[model samples]
Target: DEVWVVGMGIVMSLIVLAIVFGNVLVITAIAKFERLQTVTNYFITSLACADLVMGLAVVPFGAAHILMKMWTFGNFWCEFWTSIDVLCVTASIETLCVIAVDRYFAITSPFKYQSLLTKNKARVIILMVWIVSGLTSFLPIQMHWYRATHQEAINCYAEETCCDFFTNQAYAIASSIVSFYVPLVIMVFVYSRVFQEAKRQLADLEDNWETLNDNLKVIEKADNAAQVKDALTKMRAAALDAQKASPEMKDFRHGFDILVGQIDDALKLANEGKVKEAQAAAEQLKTTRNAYIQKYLKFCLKEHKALKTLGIIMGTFTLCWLPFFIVNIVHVIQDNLIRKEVYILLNWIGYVNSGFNPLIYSRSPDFRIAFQELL
Candidate 1:
């Protein structure tokens, strides 16, 4: 099928410009805001940086391929371009995986969340993400292994301008697994465990609060009984003129009755020489109070888990990447090759992933604040 070079270039150029502009705003927000420096925000920023680079490096090349109908640029540019393209894409995916793991630690083991997400550790992880992405991106190119045989005019190769379908399938499969599936599985596992742990923690807090309320009732009854005894003593000491009880004395009578009921059970146990059991019961009451207080502490910590970060990271990754995955599946199974329009559309969709990170980062409170202060 013949390609519409001019139309393709125009569409791709627009996409590149939009993506670049969006990412720049995101970076500005992060750089200006000091509050955006949380562990999650750091990964998000790294993701944005990587995506921006990929967009800048890959988009124009893509447009030129559609327009010129050949790479005309030599093997050096081809390898370098492909390497940069793959590296940035791989880095972004890896960065997302890192975000998922960080959230898992935050939600599942909140006590250690701060420590694990410390700035130094986050920096190291970001560096590692770039290194690994760079390695994965260039490995196939370095190995001189091309799996695709359909010589279209849009592939990364310099000769045919199309993807080399004739390259080694094993290498292609390996690269695909490394670039896509690995990060996907890790994300699924981390998010699943995190959600489950959060639910369990919440349930435990509820149970502890219930137990505390029951214990408080017991303590209240005990204190009320003591008050009634003192009121009764005062009434007997005072001279009363009326046969009917005065309001003050009436209050004492009611207190005495309530107090008696409250102490009756305890008194029975004491009289039966079960002091040890009573002491044990009092200890249980104290334990319940401590448990209640601990539950409150856990509640506060859980709130800090930052569900927003979790949602943004996971949600963005899935939405941005799903279209690309679908396109890939179609290419693998379809009898007829994908048409130019369909291919270009899918390419644009895939490119969207490169720009999403900045948006996610800027939405963070810290980054937003930092950005405002910078301005």
Candidate 2:
């Protein structure tokens, strides 16, 4: 127990520091940099505020409770701590839900997003999130909906005694469904749609790129055919000028004329938008230009890079939050049979999401630069 206590203390302390410091940096960087003050960043700022509260108001009390292995604070402090905990965590989840919705519109319908999600509108949404969180947390706690019916045990663990409301089945299920399940469902739906739209856009871009490349190939083939025709004209003129010179010139003229005719036919097909036939004809002429193909390949590489970046962001968010939410569902359905260690671990895992937000922002060049300048 002592060893586990020390380990948990160290881990929780580091997490608290990371959550507080990381969110502070994000908020500071956004405030300091005018370029980072877009509508999207405004939502991120609200999210940071929620996370900052979690670190500052929740984690310190939670850590002390854990280390002491009991609720050292009285019932009043317990209620207040539970309220703050629920408020901050619920606010964080709600803000993330809004962010997902915002990103969906921003990516899938950029022009409409500008008109729909204005600065004032975003602020209103953020205010609503806090209001909802306050009502869900403070009201429920104040009304004692989550309070345990049995008298408190003298030697109860803090996890058991401090948050009695969570022990009540109705309140537990209701709060879990609201705070975690609904947000998880929303994020899944929005991000799935976002990815679908991204793929559609990518497919359209590739098709357009392919069409452009075909056109460029046709143009290059036409130019090559023109060069060949000019060479043939010069050779035929030379042959006519030296008519009495040799029969070899006659044979060369016949073969060269057939080759030139084929090239001209290919050029005509290309002009008619028959790219494949034109390319075949150009191949017959033993001339192919690959510059445009190389350029298209480079463009595709960048497109894949962007897709990978988006995947990383979404994947990280899902990984950090999904397990905890899933466990919460299991706890509700299974009558809280989950072990205390497992519960603590999953909760910490979810909390790590707040800490990771600033790291995600740092992936942006503007955020990195602003962060450096701030330092």
Candidate 3:
């Protein structure tokens, strides 16, 4: 019992921390300041809000269900729990999908996505995600839409004090497809496009970098060519002086041809307008330029932060939730061959994902700065 408590206790405590503290930070960061307020951030804010609701409203009860191994609450409250769970979960999935869409357009175009999705429009879009999610979860469950006959619903919560979804295979399949599968497909495709565009644009910028470097090389060569001309005239003058008068000029031919040969080669290259070695200089320039400016260059110029953060979010979202949904579908398709304990464990993992977002959000500089300001 002590061992079990320590293990479960640590997991539960951290998950709660991951969910509650991080979410409030993301929400409050955007709420308290106009600096953090933007259309993309608003979508992020909406996702954080949904996750915050799950952190508050759903997770505590979920923990209770996990510990108790039964639905101690009344039947009506059981339905209510399921409804909030589905509602918030759907909201998360929906909002995540929009982030994929929003960011894709933002990258594929520029100011257009910014100009298009005003705060007012964003609020409405966010509202629709919630409303649609609420309706999807509550409506079907309330009407007993999943049950073909009324008796299945009656028996589900009638005897067992269990808060399972009590959903038919059809409902499970439908909801899984709509909530996760569709978004998964879209995010995969959309993130690919976002990455593709980012690389393409950066390459173009580097091409311009090459152009400037080449021009600078030519200008330096032109200056050196002029110096070479003057130095040659001065050499001849010095030799003529050595023939008659000056002691300083007497030694001017001491190691003469070797030095003059080197100068001649330099002048020949300059006159030919082909400084091949300057390309090597530009290569060094490219290395240093790429190293120092790599992250800020990409991040400031692109939405890699969003792309990366969303990728992390999606990865966490998938790892947490995918097992549950996969089992959910197969549990139905395979005629309930899977164990009930496996189902519960998978679902607990999914619930923990609600806590994962805040952890992800904290990595953002904007969010971090905003959190610092608030705290």
Candidate 4:
């Protein structure tokens, strides 16, 4: 008995500390590095902070309850734990919903979202998520506004000094629907849109970039105005093709158009037997295209990788939390279909996602680099 409680308690404490440190690392990385300080990072920072709070405020109390086999801290501590527990977990899910919306706009409207989606806008959305969280957790919970079927039983529930979470069917439905179901569907559809939108932009831009190589080779070997002009015409068409595909690609078309024109002017001089000037201009074309790649193409590539990472992160969260919430609702309908330990296991699975996020965040190589620098 001593070994069971003591050993179990120590291991839980160790996991708790690890969760705290993992979340804190992401928050610290976002704050310490100017490069990592973006609007998306601000939302991620809020999420990490929520998970950090969950790791501390909720998880240890749970460990105590599990080890002690009952709520030893009385009704006051019980309600406080349940209240904040509800708040942070609800906040965490709502924030995930908000992240879905954020990424939706980011993928669909990159240029507009860039300057328009400011930090203040992000803060307001975060505040809105918490406000909704408060309604779900604090208001219904603190006001004794749950379980209308049994008023005096709830009174007895508080007196029992056991932290068994009890709620009426209606309140459970409302809380679970608002907290998980609605947002879960929203994330599902939004992620699909993000993926589809990203697909077109990526494929089209890559096609255009490869054509740039062919166009450059064409310009370099062209011996007359006809050859030079033919190359320019093909490049401009490819540029316009890119412009039609995406907003970011539209800006790329403009840049590539100017480069094509400049190369035309430079290579025409080569046709006039100005070998040195043509050679110099060819060098300039290579440098300019490299600069453009640095600015536009590589940026898009990194964003694409980050998008995949976000998708994986969202999926991980869904997989972790879904089984718990489903069991919660199912338990209300019919008890003991799954054993008590199964319910407890599901909840711990939910907690595991909080600890698992830093690992998911490190899926992006950029985050990995930042972590190495910081650690």
Native-referenced Cα lDDT, model 3? 0.69
Per residue, candidate 2 scores C-alpha lDDT tens digits across 225-256 of 45434433443343233322123335544644
* Shift of residue 292 alpha carbon in model 3, Å: 9.6
Candidate 3: stretches off by over 4 Å = 1-6, 148-154, 223-311
User: Ten consecutive residues with minimal summed lDDT in candidate 1?
Assistant: 237-246
Q: Scored by CA lDDT, what does every candidate get?
A: 0.61, 0.69, 0.69, 0.78
Q: How do the residues 1-375 of candidate 1 rate in per-residue lDDT, one tens digit apiece?
A: 336666566667777887788767666655554554467768877877887888898787756666565666666776777778778778878887887887778666565764655778889999988888877778667556554555552354445444333334455455567777899999989887887776665566455445434543454454443433332233222212111122333553454354333344444443465655444444444453454456447535645555555676677777767666555555555626656467566656667766556666455434556556545
What digit string (tens of lDDT, one per residue) describes model 4 on residues 1-375?
Answer: 598788778778888989999998888878877678778777788889899999999898888779775677777777788889888888888887887888898778777987896888888888888888988898887667774455545665757456767778888888889888998999989988887787777778889868866876876776766565566567657766765663455666677777767667665775676655665676677777788877765777777776776567777988899998999899777754757778888988888788887777556556778888768
Candidate 2 segments whose C-alpha is farther than 4 A from its true place: 149-165, 223-306
Error of 3 at 218 (Å): 2.0
C-alpha RMSD in Å of predicted model 1 compared with the true structure = 13.7
TM-score of each: 0.64, 0.74, 0.75, 0.82
Off by over 4 Å in 4: 1-7, 29-36, 148-158, 216-224, 239-262, 267-304, 307-311, 362-374
Which one is best on TM-score?
4
- How much does each candidate deviate from the true structure in C-alpha RMSD? 13.7, 13.6, 14.3, 4.3
Error of 2 at 341 (Å): 2.4
lDDT of 4 at 153: 53
How many residue pairs collide in each prediction? Answer: 18, 1, 1, 0
lDDT (0-100) at residue 295 of candidate 2? 47
For model 2 the TM-score comes to: 0.74
